[PDB]
Write a protein that binds this ligand. Sequence first.
Ligand SMILES: Nc1nc2c(ncn2[C@@H]2O[C@H](COP(=O)(O)OP(=O)(O)NP(=O)(O)O)[C@@H](O)[C@H]2O)c(=O)[nH]1
Ligand SMILES: Nc1nc2c(ncn2[C@@H]2O[C@H](COP(=O)(O)OP(=O)(O)NP(=O)(O)O)[C@@H](O)[C@H]2O)c(=O)[nH]1
Ligand SMILES: [Mg+2]
Ligand SMILES: [Mg+2]
Lengths: 166, 166
Amino acid sequence: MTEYKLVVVGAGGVGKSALTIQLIQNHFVDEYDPTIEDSYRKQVVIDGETCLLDILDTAGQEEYSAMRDQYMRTGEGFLCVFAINNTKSFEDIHQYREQIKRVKDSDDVPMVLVGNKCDLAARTVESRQAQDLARSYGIPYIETSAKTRQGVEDAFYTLVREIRQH
Amino acid sequence: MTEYKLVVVGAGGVGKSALTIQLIQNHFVDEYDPTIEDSYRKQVVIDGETCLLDILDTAGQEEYSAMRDQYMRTGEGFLCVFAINNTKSFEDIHQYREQIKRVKDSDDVPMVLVGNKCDLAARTVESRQAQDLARSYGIPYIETSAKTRQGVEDAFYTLVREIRQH
Ligand SMILES: Nc1nc2c(ncn2[C@@H]2O[C@H](COP(=O)(O)OP(=O)(O)NP(=O)(O)O)[C@@H](O)[C@H]2O)c(=O)[nH]1
Ligand SMILES: Nc1nc2c(ncn2[C@@H]2O[C@H](COP(=O)(O)OP(=O)(O)NP(=O)(O)O)[C@@H](O)[C@H]2O)c(=O)[nH]1
Ligand SMILES: [Mg+2]
Ligand SMILES: [Mg+2]
């Protein structure tokens, strides 16, 4: 069957693991548990197509650095995740974007910009500024909450549809 | 606030009204009630943007004909709906597509192809053939059921994101 190799990237603590576990296992994890590298494989049906989601959940820390090159080369699409209450994670998106473009030798890679933790009232990144950034990259912007499950299937399925139209 | 002028088109009986009422009023209508023309206006928040959805629900019958030109000219994005158990509704998509391109003087209009009634086991249009058609148009393909609410928010919100990136 068709397999889609998705990679979730972004700064430490933005909720990359919580979004992936909400999608795969249907629950919100709320504890401190830094990722090294986890993969999840799940057979699903998306718009009637039977497929397998092979998802790589990555570390937010640069002990990795050029160690990111390997997984970026094999990833077909990327969720670029920041937290709406963390301005530094939003500014860090530019560095993941440029690294992915450089390892894949391409200016248009299937990618979705995801603003997570949208359940929080202490917002520091306005949706309008993230939407402007996404518009300049030519990619979709989706807001999510791994805590309420808002936007979670939407972010992953929009990324599968982006790979489909590449 | 930002307003998005969406138009739902497709052959008679494919579920254009049932998809729109599931989104606006949260229930599945199951009765015979042919549309002449209905509009629905709803303030919503999509990816943190406060906006108003102005949705026009149209007639599946050609007593309309060139009477479609007016609403197609004012629509910013279109959901093109067929039913997965009705082959003629699928083939009719080409005629709505070409009319919209002709009235808007454009080869790329914000549009989503929606295969509705995906809860039914008596399928006559394979997802793969609809996905191929959507790929040739350069637009997203989404399967929906107004009966279970699967895919309903996804189809309308993907169309708002398509207007956003035009
Ligand atoms: N309120 C709220 N908290 C969230 C959300 N997503 C994640 N969190 C919380 O934020 C913390 C970090 O989440 P985690 O998934 O571990 O982040 P990560 O990006 O995977 N971290 P790392 O890069 O080190 O692997 C946890 O306490 C988690 O519960 C969300 O949508 N809402
Ligand atoms: N099982 C199933 N039936 C559906 C679905 N959507 C619509 N229907 C049914 O199909 C019939 C027609 O739906 P309706 O919304 O009136 O279609 P329409 O496209 O709006 N017709 P018209 O163009 O004449 O205005 C109704 O009996 C409705 O309940 C669906 O997803 N699943
Ligand atoms: Mg993690
Ligand atoms: Mg109707």
